[PDB]
Each structure stands twice: as C-alpha cells, then as structure tokens.
Design a protein around this ligand. Sequence first.
Ligand code: NA
Ligand code: NA
Ligand SMILES: [Zn+2]
Lengths: 443, 479, 6
Amino acid sequence: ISQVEAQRKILEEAVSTALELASGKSDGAEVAVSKTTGISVSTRYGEVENVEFNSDGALGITVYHQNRKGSASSTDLSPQAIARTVQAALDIARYTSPDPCAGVADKELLAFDAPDLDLFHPAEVSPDEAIELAARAEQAALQADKRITNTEGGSFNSHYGVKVFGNSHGMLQGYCSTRHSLSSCVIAEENGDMERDYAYTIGRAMSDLQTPEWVGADCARRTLSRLSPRKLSTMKAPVIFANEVATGLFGHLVGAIAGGSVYRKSTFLLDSLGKQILPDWLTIEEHPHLLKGLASTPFDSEGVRTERRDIIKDGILTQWLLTSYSARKLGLKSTGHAGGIHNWRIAGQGLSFEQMLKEMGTGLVVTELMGQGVSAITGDYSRGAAGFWVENGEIQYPVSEITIAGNLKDMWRNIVTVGNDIETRSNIQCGSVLLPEMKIAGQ
Amino acid sequence: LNLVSEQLLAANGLKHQDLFAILGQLAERRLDYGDLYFQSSYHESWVLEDRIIKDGSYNIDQGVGVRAISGEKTGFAYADQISLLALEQSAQAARTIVRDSGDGKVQTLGAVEHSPLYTSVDPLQSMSREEKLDILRRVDKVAREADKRVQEVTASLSGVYELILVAATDGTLAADVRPLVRLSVSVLVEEDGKRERGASGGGGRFGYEFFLADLDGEVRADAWAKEAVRMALVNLSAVAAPAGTMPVVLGAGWPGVLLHAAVGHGLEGDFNRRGTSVFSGQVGELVASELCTVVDDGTMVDRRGSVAIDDEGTPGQYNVLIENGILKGYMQDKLNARLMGMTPTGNGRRESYAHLPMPRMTNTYMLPGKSTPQEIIESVEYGIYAPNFGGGQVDITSDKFVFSTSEAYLIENGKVTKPVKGATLIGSGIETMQQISMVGNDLKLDNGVGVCGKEGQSLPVGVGQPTLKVDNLTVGGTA
Amino acid sequence: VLEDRI
Ligand code: NA
Ligand code: NA
Ligand SMILES: [Zn+2]
C-alpha cells in the first residue's frame, strides 16, 4: 500500500508534466500512464520450475493541432524522456492531415470526479508461498487417476496496477487495481491417444479464489472426460455452446456493433439498429460500476464516463458501441467504449445444463473452439470444435477433429434457450446456449 | 559488437568489467547457466485512410533482462532501464531460484564472428518523411484506379530499429543490429449494396526502398495495391464452400503456415523434452510421406524470419528437421538442448528483454519436388484449391490444427472453377503429412507477413512451400 | 495457445 501510493504520486506528476509541455504548442492533448508489478510462478511435478518478477511501466501521449494528430510513447518516465516524447508527438502532427473527427473527448462527457469501484485488494505473497499454491493445485490433479501420465504444470500469478489519465480539458484521475489467479493443466492417455485440459480460479482478492485442491480436481475431471474421442460424420444437427464458449458467441457482437466498423460499412449488422437481432426474451445488460468487477472501470481510455445500459433489450439492438472518433463520424456522442466493454450479464431462462441436454435430445455439445473463422463483414462462421455427442438426452462420447459452420445473423436470431449454468470468471457472463441447427463437417 | 557495445554499455556508464561482476553475483549460487540481455528499440508507423495521412506514431523502449538457470528451473527479473543498479537488482532477485552455494567458476567472456544477414543501416533515418508518405499515397491512387468498385483503402508503413547484446556464464558475448519494415494494404469493394474486403503486403530486414523496387516489371507497392483489389473482388463473387472430407491442393508461399502448425511447433525442443508432443521419441521414424523434406532456416539474407544471432548469441542455422519423411531432430534453446543431451540449433528466441527465451521457429519450409502445379490440379476429380490463407491455431498434445482460407476455389474434373467463401480446414498433423501425395517444383516463401504466438510471445517468422496435394482433409463449409 | 497470423 505504501509502494503503490509512492508510484501513484510519481505517475500523477508525469501526466501533469506531459500536458504542461504540450499545452503551448497544441490545441489539445491526452496522456495515459500505467505501472504493473507482481510475480508469476510455475511448477512441474510439484517442484518449482519458473519464478518471474514483473515490473512494467508506460507513458503515451496524443496531441492535436489544426485537427492534425500525432502520438508517441516511452517506458522511461524521467523528465528528459517525457520532454522527448512530447516533442516527438508534436513533430508528427506537423505532417499528418487535418481530420475534424479527431480530438480530445467532449468536456461534458468526462469523468472529472470518477467513482471508487473498489478494485484494489493487495496481498503480500512471497515467491515460496506462491510456489506452494501452484504445487498444491498441480499435485491434486496428478493424483486423481492413474491415466494422468504427464503435466503442463501448476501456475500462480499475483499483480497490482496503477493507471492515471489526463487531458487538456483539465481532467486528471487515477485508480489502483489487483488481479490474482491459480491454474493447473495435465495430460491423460488411453491407447496411444493423449489429451490435455486445464482448470483455474481468478479474482481481485486472494480470499475470492477457489482452493488449490478444487482447481486440481476440476482439471483432472475435465482432462479425463476428453479421452478416446470420435470424429463425427458430416451432418446437420442441433448444437449447444457450453457456458465457457457461449460467452465468446455473444462476444462476436462487440466487433459487429463497434462504431469503427459501422462508419466504414464493414459490419453485417450495418442496417440492424433498432431491429430484433436476438430472441424477444433476451436482454444483454452492461454494468461498468460493479464493485470489484472483473471488467469494471471508472472511465474509458479517453476519460469518458461509463454507464449502465441494456445493449440488447428484449432482442432489439438499442445502440452502437462508440468512441469519440466513431461517434463524430456518425453525428452522435461517445458511449464510453474506448478500450472495450465493461461487464455483460445475460440471465438464464430456467433450465440447468442437464435439462438442456434432455430438451435437445440428440445433438452436439461444444466445449472448446479453435481458429479465427468469423467474417466481420458477412457474419459467416466456420470454427474447429471439440466437445461431446449427445443421444437419448445423455452424453455418449467425446468428439474432436470436426468443424461447425453457419452465419451469426441466423445463429443469434434463432437461439432456443440460455441456461442458468452461468460462467462467472469472465467479462461476458452467461450460461449454455442451444441453437437448432449447424453444419458439422467431419468424416 | 563494438558499435552496439558503445550504444548499450558505454553510453549508460557500463564496462566489460561490470558484466564480470554481475555474472559473478549470479554464480554465487549453484547454477548451470546465467545471462544478461540488453536491448534498445525504436518503432514508427504512418497510416493513410480516407485519402489522407491520418496518423503517425513514434515508440521507444530499452531495458535489461537477467536469468539464472539450474536444470529445469529458471529465475528471471528485468528493468525498463540500462544501468548498474538495474542489473544488480535484477541479478539478486533472479538468483534466488536456488539457495545452495555454487563453485563460482564461469567461463571467460569472448566473442567470435558470425555471418552478416542484414544491414546495420537504420531504416527510420535512411529515407525522408515525405518519400515514406509518397509510398502510401501511391498505393491509395493505384488501388482506387484499379476498379470503380473500390470505395475504401487503408495503407500502413511500419519500421523497427533494434540493438541487442548478450553476455553469459558459458563465455558467450555477442550482438546484433536488427532492421524490420512492413507495408500493409486493405481495401473495401461495393457493388449493388454488397461489400467485401481484401488485403496484401509484406517486407523484411532492410529499408523502405524495397517497396519502390521492381517486382516482375512493376513497382512493388503498385503490384501489392492491385493484389488487395484482386483479392477483394474474388471474395465479393465467392459462393458457399462445400462441407466434408475431400482432396485439398495448397498453393505455394503463405499456405506453408499449415506446415508451420502441423509439424513446426511439434518439433520445438521444449515440448519434446517434456514428452508432451506427438513427435516425442520418434527420431528415425516415418512421420511424413517420403516426398517431404522440411527445414527451419535462420540464415536467409534480408528475410523477416532470419536471425544473424538468436537471443542467446547462437548464429542462425540451416536445420533439416524431416528428410524424405524421416524425423531427424528438434529445434533447441540452450536449456532444452542441455536437458536432452543435444546441442544449440540457433532457435533460442524471446519477444524482448522483459520475456524468457524458448525454442522458436525462424523461416520454416518444404523443399520442392518433381510435379508441376498444373499436374497437381489435373489429378483432382472433386476438391478445393487454396492459394491463400489467413491464420489459425494448433494443439500439439492431441495433434490437431485449424486454418482458415482467404482465397479458395472448387476443382472439378481437374480444372479450377468457382470461387468459394472462407472455410476452416481441420486435421491431424501427422496424418496430414502422411497424406501428401504430390509435391510441386515451385517453392516460394511468404512476402514478409508472418507473426507466430507461443506462451503469449509474438515473433516475426517466415513460412514456405511449393504447391502440394493433401489426399484427404476436412473442409468446414456449409454446402 | 499456439496462434499464427498475417
Ligand atoms: Na493549448
Ligand atoms: Na554461416
Ligand atoms: Zn506459430
């Protein structure tokens, strides 16, 4: 707490120095600084493997003159280094072209008095204490079953951060945060076939984490479930996205409704504002000010206030996700989305995962996806998959070496239900999702 | 070495004897190895969009990274500055990996020569600012003139100038001066309310003058601007791809990223030392068709993927990994080479001073065979021709890879026919290599575009191959 | 994760 307070003072001063140096030679300027400190450790077969001490720092500035922009950055925060960085950005802005949508965020939208969201819960964890937590998690996994014949280790991370933002409208605000995580990953074998899986826990406070023994048990359960998979034959069938990949399915919406995509006409949802793109019972709630939230933030990367909004309400797309620049291109105002989204919440419609298997009856559950395979401009979707085949409402065997393909427009509009089995370790939080049909490629 | 030593050591108040002292602090503990890694870098970018020079940036970083190694174990600490105090603080944290005392016997520091693979001239200073921006302006003009359906063009120029120096307990003392430039082009086309995109570009380890040099009778930047438009128009016309298992003909160049995934990562020494790769213990076995010879080659003059020295000071090498189907060996760093009873190969790479090195690729490619590309296409009754790819992913434990096409066509009765939409291909790595039944006489490498990610560390790489045939592969279309 | 791209 004393180390972080010393860092915060240094960072606030660096921001103020950079803005004052820019002020006489520019119409506007934005400055961001950060410092992250902590430890990362790994184990192999319960013994220390790596011990890494982390210490990272950064200053960036953007300046504006005659609507021309220029940017520069440095990891050195000495007064002379800051002076050189400011001069470099000013020099660039002599040669870029006037662009009226560029500039500091609107004064009326800035978080001059930003809220305290309680993101900072420090722990004094020694390297040896960190190693023992990783070793306990890995050991619990390795001891679960004799088919576990190799390992990719235990891992523990604990870090604290400080961020300060300022601009030429007179905003200067900063906040501190912490993140701790514990994981393990092991390898099982059956008849020459090797499979690997992992488990983890994450939170802002150490006392929010699952035990090392819970992590190893979950790791082993997941890994053993993958053994002896089948490659399905080519077919059309219903598909459940298990909770852990259902969050990514909604995640593709972010790029499709980003202002940057909209003004460039590079999204398949260009003509969908105010239209029903999802089932009429589905609402996606954004909550940027949740205390301790994994993706909570008191202001965006341009200093703009963040707000409670229903991005989707009863299936209808209510707004774009805008920054200062994209808002100006569209004749609108920033929505506080510079740097991304800030905690999405989608409620379940009453069924457990088991009840969802029974409703589907026969079909595919996907638990892991690989590759890119999503077109921003058309919505076309084609990704590699692993999971389980389901028949008579029961899991029959694992599957792999298959793809699932369709189009996001059709997939989102025709969702059957969303489960109560909510994944709670991510930015976007939802349960498992049932779709009526996708094309499965295989044998 | 003398030039880099003056910039990284002398200018920061450091001498050769300070290196002795800090290596000695590490060697107070029972270690197999320790090293000091020094780096400075300068990055610039310029972006054209909406017919104007929209943006520019200038980014600086510098620092030192210090490792202490005992068998399987590494202690590591680093700082965003180069100074004696930063070295002492980093060494004293790193060495805590082992408590036991060592004998203190380090090897005397001593540099040796290596072959030069690229210029030491700074690309950021060697061309004027207006000449750089004229490259982007020309790309904009040529793309828009190529077809009336072109509505948007984004063109970017990027440059890096990097100095590195490494000193180790085994006596290694070495330095590199590393330039890297890149031109990227993206276009949007529109017709009757339908829109699609296309992209081109490349570069390597040299100045920006490369982009104004000749490519087959035209200025290189013009050729690439036209290629992004061609790509976008193919995509605009493309129909649904078929679904299922069928023959696939892969084009020369960047489609070599599938080799990089299906076998390259599988032959990195860290996975094989631990026993987690499907290729572990298989040296001397048939892991691919007898038509296949695959190399990793760090020695290629001027290439994006090359390494005059790697980040541990080992000069780049031509390494034969698979020869006529038979597995010959693995790519190494110093740690994994020792543990496997093998030798360094020139594959010890790190993203920066703030990251650990590990075994990593350089330029990975398949040698040419006897078939013509025409003969390969003519051999397929029904399948896909894929001359260009985007990106993808591999799981080396289960031996599964997944890559997405960026330009693809049906083959019907031995002829290329309809363009088809982007599809993801999936298969097993070893099974796929055993299914390669024809290898073309037309080897090329990518234009200088490759990025490889492993353990969160991104590196510049190259890939290549001739045209080749995979007899059965799963195609993730909808039709 | 092992990811490769242009
Ligand atoms: Na001013
Ligand atoms: Na040589
Ligand atoms: Zn790679």
